[model samples]
Target: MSLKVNILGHEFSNPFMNAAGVLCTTEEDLRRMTESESGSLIGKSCTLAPRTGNPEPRYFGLPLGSINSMGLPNLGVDFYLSYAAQTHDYSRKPLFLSMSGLSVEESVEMVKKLVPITKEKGTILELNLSAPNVPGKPQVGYDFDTTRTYLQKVSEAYGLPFGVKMPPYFDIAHFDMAAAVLNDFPLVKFITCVNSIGNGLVIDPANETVVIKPKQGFGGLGGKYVLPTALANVNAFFRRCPDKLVFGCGGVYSGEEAFLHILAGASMVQVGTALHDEGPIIFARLNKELQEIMTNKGYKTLDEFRGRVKTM
Candidate 1:
């Protein structure tokens, strides 16, 4: 069985990857991902300048999943741009640069500068619409009109196809509305569904306290806690926007979760909490398990079953 996937005219050997922000903060982490078995990798979301981000204990791992309020910590745009210019070899694998500018103007300025570089380097740019870890920053994906306007401005400035990392929407009407906004712009070629269910509280029964220090223990939740939500968003957007692609992020720990995401319409499935806990070798195990599942099912390629879920 083959696990290859084609996205943005580039072919990948597998659909597994490190979800942005997990193992992509520095040159070392980026190199590790390339050296690992993952098909492609994205850099950490960045701002104009380096940010110290939140305090210690901002991340807490749970048995079922994990929670984090990392505050968008990154090495800044120039650092990643330079890293891409020097280290990225597109022939080996595609590099995706994620930008989470602090505000509209910041996002515009960053995109204006980044578009040229990405065009020159063949790197994909992903605008982050959800950064719930950053204190006081309301997720842009929640505001429908603001999201559209920002995308329009970014489309004008970039003048090329790119992707967006979005937060999960619980309402079906929200799915219709969000898809409507994205379909308006042909250049918005892909949507990465569900960047952690934002602002979840995880408490420690023994300590009688919150797990993380930030926001009184409220942080973005990942892992098993988000699998259903992730699949729903992936299928919702997949059913709604035929013109664009959906990249599934959230709650994928094994081949089962990965398979479910693809069946639900994910072109690619990203690993966050799992990667954080297991390291890049998780990709190898996942690919092996996924292939085994495919073989047992008598499927030869992902195309045979991608987005072909059935109703009961």
Candidate 2:
């Protein structure tokens, strides 16, 4: 059985990779990811300049998942851009650079500046539309017209196919709206579903207090808490955008979750909370487990079951 999956005319050995913002900030973290047995590697979502990010105790690990109000902490765009330039071997694994610009001007400028370098380095771009922890800054995915306008400008400037990391939509009408907006841009090759269920509060009942420090402990919820919502967005976008592919994120901790994502029409699956807790070695284990499942299911290729979910 083969675990190969293709995206934007590129082939990956497996469908597992680190989601942006999880174990992807420093050079050491990225080096570990490159050395690990993952299908691809993605850089942290970065802003225009270096940021120390939110106050202390911004992240908290819980029983079912994790909550973080990190506030977009990163070294800077130059750091990731340098790393992207140095990564020359696409044959080994592809590198995706994520940009979560703080504003329209900053985001568009970053894309303009990186377009040439990204093309030269053979790297993929994942424009992030959702950054829930950036205090007072609303998620672009929540605003339909703004999202479309920003994408239009980026698409026009980049002059190449790229992906967008989107927040989950709860309503069917919202699905239609987001799909319609995305369909307008032909250059949007892929859509990454669900960037953490934003604004979730986890309470410490014993102490009668919040878990995280930022936003009074209101942070993005990840891990098992978002599996169903993640799957819903994956399937929703898969069914709506026939031309574009979907990269599944959120709640993927094991082979079963990854398998379910592919069955729900994800071209690839990203690991967040698991990656944060277990580190890069998790990739090897997840790959082996997924392979075992495929063997038992009598499936030889991902194409056999990807996007082939049955209805009751």
Candidate 3:
């Protein structure tokens, strides 16, 4: 009957939380999450400095999920760090400070800046290696050399364990390559997979226009559109990185989705598109539904079925 799970050395009552962005851009927004039913509070990935981000119509919701080109918008590291220092009630729900630095140097600076406070509060660090909306900047998780560059610097700057939000890789070789790079960094403890399918376009048939106004209507896609892809990445890393924990993100709107994620070896599941559409209260429902499913299957804990997805 226990839904509790441990991640990054912190335990959570449940495994559902936001996927950095979506209701976590501001302190008030993050506070709301802390006050609600979410299992953890992951602040929106912040850059070294505040950024206004791309033009209007940066985010648009779709029936299937959502599309966004938020362009790394945030209130900056100092602002988020200041608030982050104020709370981290790890007993109730740990805080995961997500960062997306503008450059490798900036990333290292961020790690250095966060070291003292994070070490003090036990806050988990998650580097966003796959921000698809940042124009002209390639996702580091997709490139082994770049990922190594960031990880090498990060591990040196800070000694504590950390995590990374990664882009979805379509090829098997690409998965092996990414896993290979990740295995080299013991400090990088967990991996949040499949940051929205990059550069997706959703057209409005009636209006004859793109749904969003960024990059000629290109943006990251989330929700049901990427569930299978998310599952694949989660399972891939779970199998490849024997010691590292895998986090599931993308296309989670229900307990079924979360359960599927856990079945694929996800130690935690992050909500984004669905969290945006349904709000923090959605966690309660997902918890209940997952419990019901487990009960029906005659199971009491997630561990029984986790990573047991049948191949036949």
Candidate 4:
């Protein structure tokens, strides 16, 4: 059998998924990702209307992570729907519409716009309530009352497997309430436990210029810097509540990393920066390498050792 993962009410052939907010600036990019055999195509973060995003200097890369302040830029829901309708020919691949918003009402409206596409095959919705790039938005996933309230409303209105993106913050004691909401909603589906690291800034040093544009004077750090953080969070969630489903992301650049996430209890792994750096090669190589690792480990199935944590 193949590596299969269950999210909400569905099953995936592989645990490899596209991380939200990469280089999906056009439908062609999405189509290329789908053709590359990625497990799922998570579109770039979008809102209800068209946006031009930040200025030229919006992204900056560092050794451990990259800081970006691209203000949730995309072609918006209306444009995406038209694009998807025109070129959506992928029969078996799953399409995930990852959405972000400035307020609860806008988020809900974005979901409403996606309802028609949700009815189509292999489509899912991901609510990114944790991104720190947007202005005036609190760390929604960390606060219990707000987290619970937002998720409850979105889960109810969407009526689909709505996965919530988590932030890498220690003070976020709201995981329980958030997880509870997901557990309660049998249809709430899977959980993607991360986005870029937040409240970070990379300076140009000599020139004393901000590397990325942030209204707050900085941006979120992502990539390897977030890998360990993401793993620890996923491990903790898996250990504490084995019943909930999880989509593990952050710092996953290769097959070994993907396998490590599985061992740490992620039902699947999403690759974002890897694709940014190495392009489609990472996706193809990961799938091949994962199969090899499984075979060499004397495992007949990917599920054989999922979340098989030990005291070592």
Q: Per-residue CA lDDT of candidate 3, range 33-129, in tens?
A: 8887878879899998899889989899888899999998899999888877875455667888899996889999998988988877888899999
Cα lDDT tens digits, model 1, 1-312, are: 689998898899899889999999999999899998899999999999999899989998899899999999999999999988878767778888999997888988888888777778888889999999887889999999889988999998888899999999999899999999999989999999979999999988898999898888899999999999999999999999999999999989999899999999999888999999999999999999999889989999989999999999
Please list the C-alpha lDDT of all candidates, in the order they appear. 0.91, 0.91, 0.89, 0.75
Candidate 2, lDDT over the whole model = 0.91
Model 4 misplaced stretches (Cα beyond 4 Å): 6-11, 171-174, 180-184
Provide the lowest-lDDT 10-residue window in model 2. 83-92
Estimate, for each residue in 1-312, the C-alpha lDDT of model 4 and write its tens digit: 578776656667788877888757578788777777677677877788878876767777677757788877888887666656556655656677778876788888888777777776546777887778767777787676777667767876787666778886454455555556556656555677777788886776799877665564577777888888888778777765566677788988777889888988898788877777877667778988898888889877778988886766
Q: Is candidate 1 or candidate 3 better by lDDT?
A: 1
Write candidate 2's Cα lDDT for 31-134 as tens digits.
88888899998999999999989997999998899999999889999998888887435667989989999888888888887887877777899999999998
The local distance difference test score of model 3 is 0.89
Q: Flag regions of model 2 displaced more than 4 Å.
A: 87-89
| Per-candidate count of clashing residue pairs (backbone under 3 Å) | 0, 0, 1, 1
Residue 281 in model 4: lDDT: 62
